[PDB]
Design a protein around this ligand. Structure first.
Ligand SMILES: C[C@H]1O[C@@H](Oc2ccccc2[N+](=O)[O-])[C@H](O)[C@@H](O)[C@H]1O
Ligand SMILES: C[C@H]1O[C@@H](Oc2ccccc2[N+](=O)[O-])[C@H](O)[C@@H](O)[C@H]1O
Lengths: 329, 329
DNA sequence: TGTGAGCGGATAAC
DNA sequence: GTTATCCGCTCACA
C-alpha cells in the first residue's frame, strides 16, 4: 500500500512531523533539511491520502451532486459546467447518479453524498414539493440547492424561467397568426415538463386559444415521433406545435415530413433547449435557449455562498430566449 | 456534526462495538439487544462516515474514472453505464473530468484519482502510445484499463472494432456500387478518429478506390456542416460519404440538402455510433452501432477482474454492426 | 460482546 | 522544529 509520511521519514532521516512541515510549506524548516526531504518524497512518489487529510480536519470545500441519469442531455451538460466551474474555483466535486425513479432513491443518493462529508449539495433531480422539503431536511446541517423543483417550492433553487420560455414560444406562434396549435409535453413525472406544460396553457389562454391536441413524450426523439404520428393519424393536423424539448421536436419534425407535410410551411415547430444539434436540423429548429453553462456555473457559485452563510436564500430565475430558425414560418 | 457510532451507544445503552456489530450484520448479538440498537440508530439518523470507513481499512472496490468532457455524447453514455453497472455490483465510483487537452492534464486527473485511493482506474481519454504507457506507469500499483487508445498499445484496453466498423461501411457503399466516395473524419487529435480514418483507407484500398475528398471535423454537427459545404463549393461532389460519427453526419446531411441534393438518392451517407437521435434524422441515418452500455458494463467487470489479479491482461475488442436506414440508396 | 492499538495527518501548544 | 494526542473506525483479542 501507498507511500506513507512515515516512509519519507526514514528515507530522509527525519520524523513524520518534519516531512509534514515541508509538505505544508512550513514555518521554520532546517533550510537544507527541506531540500533533502523534498528529494526523498520525489524519488518515492508521495501522494497525500486525502481520505486521511479530511478525517484529520483539513477544511477542504467539497461539492456533492445528486443528478438524474447522465445519459440525458441537460443533466450531463450541467454536471459538466458544474465540475468545470468547480475546478476553476479550486473546489472538488463528487457526484451520485440516481437512476431508479422515486424519492427513496434520491434520498439514498443524498445519504452517500452526506457520508462523504460534502460541504454542500446540489440536487438536479425531479422532486415534488414536500419530497423536496424532506430531502432538504435530511441534509443534516449542510446547504442544499435545487435545480429541478418548482419556483413555488420553499427551498433554495435555480431554474430557467419557464414563464418566459413558454410565453416567448406562444407569442411567437400567435404573431405568426397560428390558432390551431398542438402541444407535445415532456413526461409528467418531470417537474420541469409540467412547468412548461402549464406555461403553455397559461399564455395560450391569455390569447383565447385552446390546444387542439395535447400529447406526452419522454424526452426522446422516438417519442416525439410516435406521438406526432398517432396525432396525425387521428386526423388532427395543427399548423404549429410547441414541443417540450429539441429532441422530441426532431421526432416531431420527422413524422411531419414523412407524412408529406412541410415543417415550417405546413406545420411550424418550436423546441426547447437549443441543443448544439438543433441548429443543423432539417430545417434548422426554432427553439427556446437554456444556457446550461450558466446554470451549472451559477449553481456552484451559489452553493458556495450559502455554505458561507451568505444571505441569498430562496429561488432564483435564469433568463431564457427565443432563437428564430426555420421551423416557424 | 453528524450522528456518531458513539451517539447510538448511549441512546441504546451499549458500547461503540455493540452498535458496530449490529451495523455489520454481526456474529453473535444479544438477540433482543440488536432489536433495541437498530431502533436507536433509526430514531437518530445514522449515516456511516465513509471517509472514516475507508481510512479504517474497509476494502471498497472504489473505481476511479478519468474521462473526456461529459459534454460529449459517448463519454457521458459511458460514464453512465459505468456508474450503473458499478452500483449493481455494490462498487463505488469517483470520476475526474479532464477538459484541458494534453497528457499533463490527464496525469493531473490520474493523480487526484490516486489520492482518493481508488482500487483501479478506467481511463476514457485519448492517449498516444507512449503517453498511455506513462499514465499506465503513474498508476502506482493499481490496475488501469484504457478505452481511448489504439489496439496496438501494449496495455489493458477495451475498444470497439474500428476494423469491423470501417469495413462494414465501405463494403456497404461499394455493394451499392459507389466509387466516388468522400471522407469526413473526426479530429485527428483523437485516437479513435484516426483509427476510423485508417480503417476507411485500409478497406477503400482493398476495393481499389480512392477518396475523392477527405476532410476533418470536430465531432460537432456544425463542423460536419461547414466541411461538407466547403467540399461542395469546391465542386467536389461524391455519391456517398463516410462520416466519423452520427452528429457530423447530421451536419453533412444538412449541407447536402440545403444544396438541392437528395441525401440517399444523390449523395448517400453513413454515420458512426447509432446515437438515439440518429434514427429520426431526415431521413433516418444508416450508421455503425457502438453499444455504449456494453462498453461501460464490460469496463467495470474487467477492472474488477484485474483488481483481483485475474489473468485477463491485454486489449479487448467489442463487436459493432451495420444499421441500414435510409441514407444509403 | 467489552477492551486496546494503529490508519495518514493536523494543529496548537510544547 | 518537535511532541502529544484525537479524527471516527475496523478488528483482532480477549
Ligand atoms: C435546463 C433545464 O432543462 C431540463 O432538461 C431536460 C431533462 C432531461 C432530458 C432533456 C431535457 N431537456 O431540456 O431537453 C432540466 O430537467 C431542468 O431541470 C433544467 O436543467
Ligand atoms: C465508443 C467510443 O467512441 C468514441 O466517442 C466519441 C467521442 C466524442 C464524440 C463522439 C464520439 N464518437 O464516437 O462519435 C470515444 O472516443 C471512445 O472513447 C469510445 O467512447
Amino acid at each position: 500500500k501507498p507511500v506513507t509520511l512515515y516512509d519519507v521519514a526514514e528515507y530522509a532521516g527525519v520524523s513524520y512531523q518534519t516531512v509534514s512541515r515541508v509538505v505544508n510549506q512550513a514555518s521554520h524548516v532546517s533550510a537544507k533539511t527541506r531540500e533533502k526531504v523534498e528529494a526523498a518524497m520525489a524519488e518515492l512518489n508521495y501522494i497525500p491520502n486525502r481520505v486521511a487529510q479530511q478525517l484529520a480536519g483539513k477544511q477542504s470545500l467539497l461539492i456533492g451532486v445528486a443528478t438524474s441519469s447522465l445519459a440525458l442531455h441537460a443533466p450531463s451538460q450541467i454536471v459538466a459546467a458544474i465540475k468545470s466551474r468547480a475546478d476553476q474555483l479550486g473546489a472538488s466535486v463528487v457526484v451520485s447518479m440516481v437512476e431508479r425513479s422515486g424519492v427513496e432513491a434520491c434520498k439514498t443518493a443524498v445519504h452517500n453524498l452526506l457520508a462523504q462529508r460534502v460541504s454542500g449539495l446540489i440536487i438536479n433531480y425531479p422532486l415534488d414539493d414536500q419530497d423536496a422539503i424532506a430531502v432538504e431536511a435530511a441534509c443534516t446541517n449542510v446547504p442544499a440547492l435545487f435545480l429541478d423543483v418548482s419556483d413555488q417550492t420553499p427551498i433554495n433553487s435555480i431554474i430557467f424561467s419557464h414563464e418566459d420560455g413558454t410565453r416567448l414560444g406562444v407569442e411567437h406562434l400567435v404573431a405568426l397568426g397560428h390558432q390551431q396549435i398542438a402541444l407535445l409535453a415532456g413526461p409528467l413525472s418531470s417537474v420541469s415538463a409540467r412547468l412548461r406544460l402549464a406555461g403553455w396553457h397559461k399564455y395560450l389562454t391569455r390569447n383565447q386559444i385552446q390546444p387542439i391536441a395535447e400529447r406526452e413524450g419522454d424526452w426522446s426523439a422516438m417519442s416525439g415521433f410516435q406521438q406526432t404520428m398517432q396525432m396525425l393519424n387521428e386526423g388532427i393536423v395543427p399548423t404549429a406545435m410547441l414541443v417540450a424539448n429539441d429532441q422530441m421536436a426532431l421526432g416531431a419534425m420527422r413524422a411531419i415530413t414523412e407524412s408529406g407535410l412541410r415543417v415550417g410551411a405546413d406545420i411550424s415547430v418550436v423546441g426547447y433547449d437549443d441543443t448544439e444539434d438543433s441548429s443543423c436540423y432539417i430545417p434548422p429548429l426554432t427553439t427556446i435557449k437554456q444556457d446550461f453553462r450558466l446554470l451549472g456555473q451559477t449553481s456552484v457559485d451559489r452553493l458556495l455562498q450559502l455554505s458561507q452563510g451568505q444571505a441569498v436564500k430562496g429561488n432564483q430565475l435564469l433568463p431564457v430566449s427565443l432563437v428564430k430558425r426555420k421551423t416557424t414560418l
